[PDB]
Design a protein around this nucleic acid. Structure first.
Ligand SMILES: [Mg+2]
Ligand SMILES: [Mg+2]
Ligand SMILES: [Mg+2]
Ligand SMILES: [Mg+2]
Ligand SMILES: [Mg+2]
Ligand SMILES: [Mg+2]
Ligand SMILES: [Mg+2]
Ligand SMILES: [Mg+2]
Ligand SMILES: [Mg+2]
Ligand SMILES: [Mg+2]
Ligand SMILES: [Mg+2]
Ligand SMILES: [Mg+2]
Ligand SMILES: [Mg+2]
Ligand SMILES: [Mg+2]
Ligand SMILES: [Mg+2]
Ligand SMILES: [Mg+2]
Ligand SMILES: [Mg+2]
Ligand SMILES: [Mg+2]
Ligand SMILES: [Mg+2]
Ligand SMILES: [Mg+2]
Ligand SMILES: [Mg+2]
Lengths: 206, 141, 56, 143, 63, 100, 145, 67, 82
RNA sequence: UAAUUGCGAUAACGAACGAGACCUUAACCUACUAAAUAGUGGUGCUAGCAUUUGCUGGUUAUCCACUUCUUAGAGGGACUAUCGGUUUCAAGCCGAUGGAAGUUUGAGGCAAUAACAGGUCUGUGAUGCCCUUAGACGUUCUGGGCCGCACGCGCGCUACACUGACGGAGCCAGCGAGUCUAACCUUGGCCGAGAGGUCUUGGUAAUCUUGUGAAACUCCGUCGUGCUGGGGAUAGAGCAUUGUAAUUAUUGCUCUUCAACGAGGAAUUCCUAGUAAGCGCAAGUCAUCAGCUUGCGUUGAUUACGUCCCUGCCCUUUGUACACACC
């Protein structure tokens, strides 16, 4: 690392976070290894990105959706429920505010906390109407690893959406305690409570 | 005979045309330093060309960008394509080639868009629906 | 004194009116089409039919 | 070294320049200040309600100094926004032109903007430096 | 709460009224050379590790 | 003198002939000319319901017609401008000549 | 900036113009409980009397209350543009009025009954109770009572 | 769909029957023969003609093709 | 109005409107042990209101007790300082 | 295969139509062909920061040079190309590579035979027959009505709040339109709270409105979970504009008034990348009026690549008491 002087003043803080290593905005995407197997190669890690604003051409096919970062995935589920459909300017901004909260509470790496919560939240059993005809009912099957992150991220973002609805805790903070609770587990998380309900319901259908 | 070159980048309907010449290395956004894009989030998304390969490669060359058309996020993507190509174009036929190719793997490895732009354009609307693909609705009574 | 957009639209109006004239009045003369050629200070109309001596 | 209005961000520049007129405090007062709605699409006037004739001049002059010539009709389309006309969808509605017309008239006698050819209002000899000199310490305010 | 880890070796096909459930044969990570068939809801490639809350239940063969 | 030529036909293949024929005349006459500049095809759109009635599926098809414009600048004395304005006449092709 | 610690002058809901105006809400929006004053009318009077709009209504010096009312009772006398008001050259004298807590429903009834003795079309429709604004009535207004 | 039609099957088959001691197994050279050795009304057909030509010319390299 | 819906009421919260000495001394001795204070944090915490919370963070940072890390509108992120 | 799209036994020889090919449109060309009706760099005159070589600008009779970006014509450019697996191993996809472009590259136009007693005699001076034809069912004029209102539905618009509302700021599109023997689009100055008015100017249009400075939007603010600054239905009063004429308010502006609605049950619709969904602009209607439509651009998700469950569609076998054919 060395400072660079130039005709137009470029401040020093921006330069540092790219020379020693290509970081996030202010945080790090390395040492975010996934502790629980069967999810690695589906939760995208080891290629950091600066900002979650990126339009990747990922839409012609069936299985290349394990290559875009989990961070931008979580951002893209904030844009839902009508009035805020699209508008990725605020989806990025809200997640910018969220990572400030997991930085201060649960002092673990905010990227690590998010990734840990995703693995801990994805149900591994679900129901399906299967039978030999009209005599068909709930049937228990297993959830694929790609669907797990799909199922997991859905509950995390909608918990903040519904909880910040008609409640003063903003979306930027209401998503924090969901991740805080989803990672370690307290059964007061919106997503974790849905997870155990879904698994137990599927278990009863054996 | 001032050394100079000009290339362009784009987005959905935006078209940026950066001017790449040898100089002190000042960067402008249509009149102003590149620190004043002001989405305040996409700033590192357009800092990507400057910082991914380092500012020493941009130290001896200045860039002036003119951006037209598109949306607000589209104009930011316009700037990054032209700046990425401009360094590649300058290092191809003023600087030695072995700098140019190693720059290509510097860009296309991290984000594909910087040198090869998207092949996606808006689709015309069709009668029978509000947009290009959806229908209005249907009612049978 | 007319916009070029309006001129070529009204130019096609001239042909459509002329075509419906030359098919209603020259119906039994084997009329088979018409086309209009524009010249400075002179306008031409070609009536393409079979019984030209009967048309004249 | 060199200081340009384009070398400073937009928000801090207009906020700093607006205060300078408030400190100097001699240009004009329309006579109906703070009674006017400032548009036909804004259903409430300026919330601070302290200025809008010393702070509007901070943002209109920045455009006029930037571009070649801007007239009062251009501001109406520029500073306007969608008007929520009740149960109806949104529609672009221009702004109140009287304040736009009269804020420029004050700029005439203070030597900032004067009459210009091909119509419109253009910055004057004193206009260019005055903005740059004011915008100067907005860069040295960091020390 | 013993969770079993098994790895897909082949994708048999789609199953269900609307075919929403894929058919898979897996090999156990621990105690290998044992193969079982499981009904999986979502999409499954090869070389993808599964987790189960139950081990001795083979999916009914569609034949 | 600064005479200017303009071509506004609707048929490019017919219209490119006249523009080609006029540029070659001055070039073989050794007179400086401003090359043929082709304006964007201004589009006149008319969209209507196909049906004469009001019933059936609401099919909305468009009829389009395109206008192709060309203009060329010349500097020629009076003697040769007269013989070039009365030539290069094609059906459906409109030309207007303005001096200065 | 600095925050006032506390004072004994704070009071709960107070009384003026036959309306118990609530406290603990800003004087620009606390005075919208009285009819005849809207979101704008309170905004205009509070600044014309040199009253701090940011200051709430719960903490508001008593002598500042009656300074407000005479401005509200006679706006034209205290340099108002005079097109704010809702009754100008009302029907009777050409003087500019503005209906308030008691006269908003009093003058509405007078405007209601002005056109009934005249046997106008609008007056009859009000007596009939239907929409007098010339709207379509085939489909709108079914649950009107 | 990428299954070629009769107008591509027959025009290509007509070429090897008559241009065997001729245009080789490389597409970009074949298409620069077809544009002058044959009058083809459309470029897209000519591109598909020299396409199925190369595919058949690549077959004749290893053994003969029946038909 | 054809429902089978109950339309239950709310708790009718009683958040304070303006500060007072009995609570002003309470905030300055309770903002510690809060590793995160914000406008909505200081709502389920000490009963000051939405505007009171905003003016409090504006005041407790003007003199300064804890280091603030964000100034973005509509979301304030603060943390205690060593 | 999307396709009797391709292809090899074998009682058939070729063909025609359809699909496709074709036309339009969409993106690549730093290579061909030109441009103050478009631009860019430099030199003249000139403004500002600094004064030190630089940075941001303006200038039409100050020229000079060029065409990356914008327009274009003819063209080139993709044909699934290169490689490993699959099936009498007979041709694509997969896996990857290349590229601007590899779901016929995307989307449209065109779109067969045969039928419906489908709609249309209110577009026609396109019609047969029937009616009528002088207080005419012909024409025109005046005032009404098509809007009328206990109620039941359809296509929709605005919403039920902090992913918020509102206030000052930053601020970006493409599709198009536009007056002559007429009165169209109108920048600019001035007046006005606003609506709007007033005096000139520009434009038959890449030169002017137009960079259509759109809106959703981003920064600072105020609010604070209260049917509250959500929501603005209902009403009352005044000022304008269109129109000979607006009363059952044409429409715009100003203040006041402030209802349901607290996310909506059975049911039910559409949708697979720049696609849904959200956002606004232009045009068609227009003397005035969008909550419609036809287009355009803006931000941009989730879930599959599936199956025959439903509802339909296509081909073969089989059954038929059906033939205006399962109503
Ligand atoms: Mg909430
Ligand atoms: Mg859309
Ligand atoms: Mg605005
Ligand atoms: Mg909206
Ligand atoms: Mg100059
Ligand atoms: Mg191959
Ligand atoms: Mg097609
Ligand atoms: Mg008819
Ligand atoms: Mg009649
Ligand atoms: Mg009707
Ligand atoms: Mg319909
Ligand atoms: Mg706003
Ligand atoms: Mg544009
Ligand atoms: Mg409101
Ligand atoms: Mg349906
Ligand atoms: Mg219109
Ligand atoms: Mg599909
Ligand atoms: Mg039987
Ligand atoms: Mg039988
Ligand atoms: Mg029978
Ligand atoms: Mg039956």
């Amino acid at each position: 690392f060395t400072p660079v002087v130039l005709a137009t003043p470029i401040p020093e803080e921006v330069q540092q976070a790219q020379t020693e290593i290509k970081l996030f905005n202010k945080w790090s995407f390395e040492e975010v290894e996934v502790k629980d197997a069967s999810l690695v190669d589906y939760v995208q890690v080891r290629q950091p990105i600066f900002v979650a604003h990126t339009a990747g051409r990922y839409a012609n096919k069936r299985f290349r959706k394990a290559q875009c970062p989990i961070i931008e995935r979580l951002t893209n589920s904030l844009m839902m429920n009508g009035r805020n459909n699209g508008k990725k300017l605020k989806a990025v901004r809200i997640i910018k505010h969220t990572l400030d909260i997991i930085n201060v509470l649960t002092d673990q790496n905010p990227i690590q906390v998010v990734v840990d919560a995703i693995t801990n939240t994805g149900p591994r059993e679900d129901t399906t109407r299967v039978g030999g005809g009209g005599a068909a009912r709930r049937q228990a099957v297993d959830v694929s690893p790609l669907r797990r992150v799909n199922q997991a991220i859905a509950l995390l973002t909608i918990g903040a959406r519904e909880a910040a609805f008609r409640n003063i805790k903003t979306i930027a903070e209401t998503l924090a305690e969901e991740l805080i609770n989803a990672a370690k587990g307290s059964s007061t998380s919106y997503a974790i409570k849905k997870k155990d309900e879904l698994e137990r319901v599927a278990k009863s259908n054996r | 005979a001032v050394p100079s070159v000009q290339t362009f980048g784009k987005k959905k309907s935006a078209t940026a045309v950066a001017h790449v010449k040898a100089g002190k290395g000042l960067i402008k956004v249509n009149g102003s330093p590149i620190t004043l894009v002001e989405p305040e989030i996409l700033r590192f998304k357009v800092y990507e060309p400057l910082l991914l390969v380092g500012l020493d490669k941009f130290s001896n060359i200045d860039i002036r960008v003119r951006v037209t058309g598109g949306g607000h996020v589209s104009q930011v993507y316009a700037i990054r394509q032209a700046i990425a190509k401009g360094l590649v174009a300058y290092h191809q036929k003023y600087v030695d080639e072995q700098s140019k190719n190693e720059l290509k793997k510097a860009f296309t490895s991290y984000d594909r868009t910087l040198l090869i732009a998207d092949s996606r354009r808006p689709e015309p609307k069709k009668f029978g629906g509000k947009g290009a693909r959806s229908r209005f609705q249907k009612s049978y009574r | 004194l007319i916009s070029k957009k309006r001129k070529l639209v009204a130019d096609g109006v001239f042909y459509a009116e002329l075509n419906e004239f030359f098919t209603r009045e020259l119906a039994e003369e084997g009329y088979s089409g018409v086309e209009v050629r524009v010249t400075p200070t002179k306008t031409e109309v070609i009536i393409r039919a079979t019984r030209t001596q009967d048309v004249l | 070294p060199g200081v340009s209005v384009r070398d400073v961000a937009a928000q801090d520049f207009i906020n700093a320049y607006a205060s300078f007129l408030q400190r100097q405090g001699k240009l004009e007062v329309p006579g109906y200040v703070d009674i006017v709605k400032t548009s036909s699409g804004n259903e409430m006037p300026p919330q601070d309600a302290e200025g809008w004739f010393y702070k509007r001049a901070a943002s209109v002059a920045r455009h006029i100094y930037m571009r070649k010539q801007v007239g009062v009709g251009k501001l109406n389309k520029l500073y306007g926004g969608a008007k929520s006309r009740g149960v109806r969808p949104y529609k672009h509605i221009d702004a109140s032109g009287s304040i736009n017309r009269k804020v420029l008239q004050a700029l005439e006698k203070i030597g900032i903007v004067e009459i210009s050819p091909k119509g419109g209002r253009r910055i004057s000899e004193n206009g260019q430096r005055d903005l740059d000199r004011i915008a100067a310490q907005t860069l040295e305010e960091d020390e | 709460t013993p969770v079993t880890l098994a790895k897909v070796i082949k994708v048999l096909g789609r199953t269900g009224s609307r075919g929403g459930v894929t058919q898979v044969r897996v090999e156990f990570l621990e105690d290998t050379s044992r193969t079982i068939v499981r009904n999986v809801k979502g999409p499954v490639r090869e070389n993808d590790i599964l987790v189960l809350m139950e081990s001795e239940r083979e999916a009914r063969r569609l034949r | 003198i600064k005479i200017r030529i303009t071509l506004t036909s609707t048929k490019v293949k017919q219209l490119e002939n006249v523009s080609s024929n006029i540029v070659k005349n001055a070039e073989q006459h050794n007179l400086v000319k401003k090359g043929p500049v082709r304006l964007p095809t201004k589009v006149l759109k008319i969209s209507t319901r196909k049906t004469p009635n009001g019933e059936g599926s609401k099919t909305w098809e468009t009829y389009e017609m395109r206008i192709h414009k060309r203009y060329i600048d010349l500097e020629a004395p009076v003697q040769i401008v007269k013989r070039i304005t009365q030539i290069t006449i094609e059906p459906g092709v409109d030309v207007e000549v303005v001096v200065a | 900036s600095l925050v006032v610690q506390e004072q004994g002058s704070f009071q709960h809901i107070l009384r003026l113009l036959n309306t118990n105006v609530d406290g603990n809400i800003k004087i620009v929006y606390a005075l919208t409980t009285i009819k005849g004053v809207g979101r704008r009318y309170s905004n205009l009077v509070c600044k014309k009397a040199d009253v701090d709009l940011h200051k709430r209504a719960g903490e508001l010096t008593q002598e500042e209350l009656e300074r407000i009312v005479q401005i509200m009772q006679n706006p034209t006398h205290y340099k108002i543009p005079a097109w704010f008001l809702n009754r100008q050259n009302d029907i009777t004298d050409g003087k500019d009025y503005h209906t308030l807590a008691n006269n908003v429903e009093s003058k509405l009834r007078d405007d209601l009954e002005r056109l009934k003795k005249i046997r106008a079309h609008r007056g009859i429709r009000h007596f009939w109770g239907l929409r007098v604004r010339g709207q379509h009535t085939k489909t709108t207004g079914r649950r009107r009572a | 769909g990428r299954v070629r039609t009769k107008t591509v099957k027959r025009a290509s088959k007509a070429l090897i029957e008559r241009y065997y001691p001729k245009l080789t197994l490389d597409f970009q050279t074949n298409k620069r023969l077809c544009d002058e050795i044959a009058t083809i009304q459309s470029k897209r057909l000519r591109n598909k003609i020299a396409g199925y030509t190369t595919h058949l010319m690549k077959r004749i390299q290893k053994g003969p093709v029946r038909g | 109005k054809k429902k089978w819906s109950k339309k239950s009421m709310k708790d009718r919260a009683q958040h304070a409107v303006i500060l007072d000495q009995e609570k002003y001394d309470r905030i300055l001795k309770e903002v510690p042990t809060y590793r995160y204070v914000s406008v909505s944090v200081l709502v389920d915490r000490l009963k000051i209101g939405g505007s009171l919370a905003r003016i409090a963070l504006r005041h407790l940072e003007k003199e300064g007790i804890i280091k603030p890390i964000s100034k973005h509108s509509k979301q304030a992120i603060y943390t205690r300082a060593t």
